[PDB]
Amino acid sequence: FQGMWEIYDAMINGIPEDFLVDELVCGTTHSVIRSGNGVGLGPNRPFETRMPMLTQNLLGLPLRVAAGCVKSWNYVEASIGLAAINAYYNNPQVAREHGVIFSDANDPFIMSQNEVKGKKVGVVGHFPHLESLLEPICDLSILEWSPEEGDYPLPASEFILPECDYVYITCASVVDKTLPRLLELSRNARRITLVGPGTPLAPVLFEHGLQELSGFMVKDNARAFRIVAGAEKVKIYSAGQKVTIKK
Ligand SMILES: [Cl-]
Numbered sequence: 001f002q003g004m005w006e007i008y009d010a011m012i013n014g015i016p017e018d019f020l021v022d023e024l025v026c027g028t029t030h031s032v033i034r035s036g037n038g039v040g041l042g043p044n045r046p047f048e049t050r051m052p053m054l055t056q057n058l059l060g061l062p063l064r065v066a067a068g069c070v071k072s073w074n075y076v077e078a079s080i081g082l083a084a085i086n087a088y089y090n091n092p093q094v095a096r097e098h099g100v101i102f103s104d105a106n107d108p109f110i111m112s113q114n115e116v117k118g119k120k121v122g123v124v125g126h127f128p129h130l131e132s133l134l135e136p137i138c139d140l141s142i143l144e145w146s147p148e149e150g151d152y153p154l155p156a157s158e159f160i161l162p163e164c165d166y167v168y169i170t171c172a173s174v175v176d177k178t179l180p181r182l183l184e185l186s187r188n189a190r191r192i193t194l195v196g197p198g199t200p201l202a203p204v205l206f207e208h209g210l211q212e213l214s215g216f217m218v219k220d221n222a223r224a225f226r227i228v229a230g231a232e233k234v235k236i237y238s239a240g241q242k243v244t245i246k247k
Contacts, residue, residue, distance in 0.1 A: 004180040005071065007208040012067045014204055015088045019063035026055050026080065027228040030197070030236065033083040034225075035063045038094065039218040040086025041197045041228070041236065042070075042079035043172045051076055063088055070174065078175045082198050089200040092217060099245065100201050100217075106242050108168065108193050108214035109133050115166070122161045122189075124154070124182060125170025125196070154178070161185040171198035171215070183209040197236055206247035214244040 023034035031042045054077060058066045063084050070081025088094060095102070109130060120139045123130060131150065134140045141160050142151040152160065157178075161167060167186040171194055173179040179194075186192045191211045199215030206213075217240050218224045224239040226232045 015064040030228045031079040031083045032228040033087040035087040038091025040083045042082030048076045089202045119165040122164035122167045167192045171196035211247040
């Protein structure tokens with residue numbers, strides 16, 4: 001169990017050296033990296049404080065070196081590390097080579113409404129409207145760092161997730177390093193899904209305690225950067241397409 005960096009090492013060690021950090025922006029809600037034609041994203045908080053000097057240095061470095069930042073206990077740095085990971089795996093050509101299907105022109109909660117009916121479901125993270133989609137059809141528990149009124153604080157994971165038939169976890173858990181314990185707590189679910197724009201589309205994760213990955217393919221590189229930089233007052237989803245791979 002306490003080979004806990006293993007899932008991080010698996011992601012990093014899959015990146016070929018040839019890939020460089022060609023572009024990097026650290027916005028209020030996401031960090032974003034381009035390596036060639038591929039763009040990856042990682043989530044930030046408005047709490048956490050910027051690091052303009054780290055940002056400058058990573059330009060030019062191997063993507064795999066920058067991905068080492070994912071392990072940082074500084075969460076803005078870790079978000080950059082996840083952006084670098086996702087610049088490799090979520091490159092449209094790389095993703096296609098690893099068996100991800102999508103168009104050059106969906107939602108995991110909607111996809112699994114039938115499957116989770118009458119079952120116990122645990123969700124870690126804040127997902128808009130999720131209560132409306134899932135609460136009427138299943139026994140739903142939502143766990144967050146800073147819970148809204150019907151929701152549980154994160155320490156409740158120890159108590160709740162082992163009882164769950166299905167578990168969904170925000171990709172923010174990669175950044176804050178809660179993911180490995182969450183995976184162990186959920187290991188007897190029928191299925192565990194990692195969800196959000198910062199999810200790596202990395203089938204190696206299916207060997208590391210996950211059965212589904214629900215992320216995001218950027219189709220408009222230039223636009224994705226506009227949004228992350230705050231130059232468009234728009235959600236990141238405008239710049240691409242949701243994509244899901246199952247084990
Ligand atoms: Cl949260």
